[PDB]
Design a protein around this motif. Sequence first.
Motif, PDB file in Angstrom:
ATOM      1  N   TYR A 193      62.487  -8.787  29.246  1.00  0.00           N
ATOM      2  CA  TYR A 193      61.466  -8.508  30.043  1.00  0.00           C
ATOM      3  C   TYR A 193      60.674  -8.738  28.484  1.00  0.00           C
ATOM      4  O   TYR A 193      60.612  -8.947  27.632  1.00  0.00           O
ATOM      5  CB  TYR A 193      61.251  -6.674  28.736  1.00  0.00           C
ATOM      6  CG  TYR A 193      62.012  -6.080  30.654  1.00  0.00           C
ATOM      7  CD1 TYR A 193      63.490  -5.863  29.924  1.00  0.00           C
ATOM      8  CD2 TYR A 193      61.610  -5.689  31.555  1.00  0.00           C
ATOM      9  CE1 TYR A 193      64.571  -5.042  30.697  1.00  0.00           C
ATOM     10  CE2 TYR A 193      62.629  -4.774  32.120  1.00  0.00           C
ATOM     11  CZ  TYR A 193      63.759  -4.512  31.628  1.00  0.00           C
ATOM     12  OH  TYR A 193      64.534  -3.641  32.566  1.00  0.00           O
ATOM     13  N   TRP A 235      57.984 -14.589  24.047  1.00  0.00           N
ATOM     14  CA  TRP A 235      59.451 -14.274  24.224  1.00  0.00           C
ATOM     15  C   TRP A 235      59.611 -12.884  24.750  1.00  0.00           C
ATOM     16  O   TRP A 235      58.770 -11.906  24.871  1.00  0.00           O
ATOM     17  CB  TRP A 235      59.482 -13.929  22.625  1.00  0.00           C
ATOM     18  CG  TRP A 235      58.300 -12.566  22.145  1.00  0.00           C
ATOM     19  CD1 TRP A 235      57.044 -12.406  21.758  1.00  0.00           C
ATOM     20  CD2 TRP A 235      58.942 -11.035  22.023  1.00  0.00           C
ATOM     21  NE1 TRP A 235      56.313 -11.631  21.128  1.00  0.00           N
ATOM     22  CE2 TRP A 235      57.279 -10.114  21.512  1.00  0.00           C
ATOM     23  CE3 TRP A 235      59.901 -10.660  21.430  1.00  0.00           C
ATOM     24  CZ2 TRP A 235      57.966  -8.935  21.041  1.00  0.00           C
ATOM     25  CZ3 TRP A 235      59.796  -9.465  20.965  1.00  0.00           C
ATOM     26  CH2 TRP A 235      59.213  -8.725  20.691  1.00  0.00           C
ATOM     27  N   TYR A 236      60.496 -12.697  24.572  1.00  0.00           N
ATOM     28  CA  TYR A 236      61.470 -11.327  25.741  1.00  0.00           C
ATOM     29  C   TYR A 236      62.275 -10.279  24.407  1.00  0.00           C
ATOM     30  O   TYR A 236      62.781 -10.880  24.070  1.00  0.00           O
ATOM     31  CB  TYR A 236      62.659 -12.130  26.556  1.00  0.00           C
ATOM     32  CG  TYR A 236      61.301 -12.825  27.717  1.00  0.00           C
ATOM     33  CD1 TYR A 236      60.724 -12.781  28.457  1.00  0.00           C
ATOM     34  CD2 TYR A 236      61.420 -14.737  27.156  1.00  0.00           C
ATOM     35  CE1 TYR A 236      60.614 -13.535  29.827  1.00  0.00           C
ATOM     36  CE2 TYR A 236      60.691 -15.276  27.686  1.00  0.00           C
ATOM     37  CZ  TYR A 236      60.363 -15.185  29.111  1.00  0.00           C
ATOM     38  OH  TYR A 236      59.850 -16.034  29.642  1.00  0.00           O
ATOM     39  N   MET A 237      62.347  -9.795  25.471  1.00  0.00           N
ATOM     40  CA  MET A 237      63.307  -8.207  24.906  1.00  0.00           C
ATOM     41  C   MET A 237      64.331  -7.583  25.678  1.00  0.00           C
ATOM     42  O   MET A 237      64.244  -7.649  26.883  1.00  0.00           O
ATOM     43  CB  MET A 237      62.325  -7.387  24.663  1.00  0.00           C
ATOM     44  CG  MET A 237      61.536  -7.053  23.155  1.00  0.00           C
ATOM     45  SD  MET A 237      60.287  -5.929  23.086  1.00  0.00           S
ATOM     46  CE  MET A 237      59.383  -6.064  24.547  1.00  0.00           C
ATOM     47  N   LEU A 238      66.046  -7.359  25.248  1.00  0.00           N
ATOM     48  CA  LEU A 238      66.572  -7.361  26.176  1.00  0.00           C
ATOM     49  C   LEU A 238      66.567  -5.645  26.112  1.00  0.00           C
ATOM     50  O   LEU A 238      67.540  -5.446  27.732  1.00  0.00           O
ATOM     51  CB  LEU A 238      68.130  -7.939  25.315  1.00  0.00           C
ATOM     52  CG  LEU A 238      68.668  -9.147  26.655  1.00  0.00           C
ATOM     53  CD1 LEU A 238      67.852 -10.540  25.407  1.00  0.00           C
ATOM     54  CD2 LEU A 238      69.923  -8.955  25.443  1.00  0.00           C
ATOM     55  N   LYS A 296      67.050  -8.270  33.197  1.00  0.00           N
ATOM     56  CA  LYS A 296      68.676  -8.170  32.229  1.00  0.00           C
ATOM     57  C   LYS A 296      67.135  -8.138  30.687  1.00  0.00           C
ATOM     58  O   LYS A 296      67.545  -7.673  29.558  1.00  0.00           O
ATOM     59  CB  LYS A 296      69.009  -8.761  32.128  1.00  0.00           C
ATOM     60  CG  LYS A 296      70.096  -8.945  32.810  1.00  0.00           C
ATOM     61  CD  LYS A 296      71.560 -10.117  32.950  1.00  0.00           C
ATOM     62  CE  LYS A 296      71.216 -11.287  33.519  1.00  0.00           C
ATOM     63  NZ  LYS A 296      70.337 -11.335  34.917  1.00  0.00           N
TER      64      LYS A 296
END
Lengths: 127, 114, 127, 114
Positions: free
Chosen positions: A124, B14-17, A122
């Motif tokens: 990354y 950090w993360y990306m949707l 969902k």
Amino acid sequence: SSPAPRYITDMSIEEISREWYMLMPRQKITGGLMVKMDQAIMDKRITLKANFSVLFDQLETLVSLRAFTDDGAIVAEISPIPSMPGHSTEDVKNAIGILIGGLEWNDNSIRASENIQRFAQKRYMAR
Amino acid sequence: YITDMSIEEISREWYMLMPRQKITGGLMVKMDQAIMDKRITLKANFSVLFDQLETLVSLRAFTDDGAIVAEISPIPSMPGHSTEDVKNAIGILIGGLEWNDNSIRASENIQRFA
Amino acid sequence: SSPAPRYITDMSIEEISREWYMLMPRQKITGGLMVKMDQAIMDKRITLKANFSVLFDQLETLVSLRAFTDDGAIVAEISPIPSMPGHSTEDVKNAIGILIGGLEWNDNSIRASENIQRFAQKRYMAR
Amino acid sequence: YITDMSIEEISREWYMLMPRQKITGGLMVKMDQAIMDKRITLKANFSVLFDQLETLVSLRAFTDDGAIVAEISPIPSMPGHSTEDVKNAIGILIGGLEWNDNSIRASENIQRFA
């Protein structure tokens, strides 16, 4: 027992007053209630806490229900729309239902406080 | 050497949707395409040679509540880059973010040296 | 040569008139021009086609530039904002730049018509 | 047997930019979380036993221009389901879609039999 309103709290005055934020703001109105949630939150355990008045073992008026991640951050809220007439029980049940449904779309797991139970891929990693 | 960001801020995972990336020179631009309608603040850590940005270590894009939604940084295994790459990467990031109706502000240091 | 406006076309009257749609609508205004693009489109070859007037080998007024996928569908457009004063050359160059930049964010590959050259993971299949 | 959708429509492969799914009984609900602010039309193919939906083969959610943004359909290797699963799946899908400010309308057949 007294049939008159009695105030029940899950939240301190800091928690209910806290300014909170949504990375991806979403909202839904149901009756006299506004439901807001951060669509970015996923795969988290979420605890629902509410402050409200009861008449005899049943929630009558909700002041605020807020959803907390384990770190104590707020990620959602159900609250009365000021310009509307006070909400119904149907509104509260509907509002909680859509909050839970909204959060579970993102594989969050929800638990509700004892007071609430009693009275009411969902993403990354960059590199 | 200029540091808009703390050690925690630059080191934070950090993360990306909705992950999107563009490469320009030795720089990688990553941004979460899912982020919309936010005020975004650009902060950067970088060396200055006399009076202009020389080497960019990281520029990260923050929401008012401190969430990271994008980053410009050297490709780790091929980091060599120029001031021109930096100017290009910034234009690219700002354009990417503004396409999703975000509003951008840059740190005083960025405005001054870049 | 004549110094007066001359009309150049890449598009038939059907193509420029066609109602078109964006799955994920995005827009950007630059000067007197509006840029719209469908953020959903990815990994496609896109061809830019425009109808416009020139003065001596240089675009003066853009009527419409539309972006086409190989199947002939329209996925983006640059067009004048009716309430604004006619756009500048700077507006057109800026508008084309942001359209191309916007589309390349999604790994689309852009090519421009000869007239334009002369005168001017990301998704998952359900199951 | 009711068919809102043509063979092409039900058979069309479709994709999600932000894929999300929920399972309810023998039914899978898939929806593209990236879709917002659209009028969405629900169309379904399903059997009717006397006067109520009995078995759902597929319900798909369409934009005005015919793009598929969500689907309810039996889990292929465990398709067994009930009218109750169907009612639940629909509520789930409509709620998911409305969270992103989409407006929903259902086919006449769906309104009638479901």
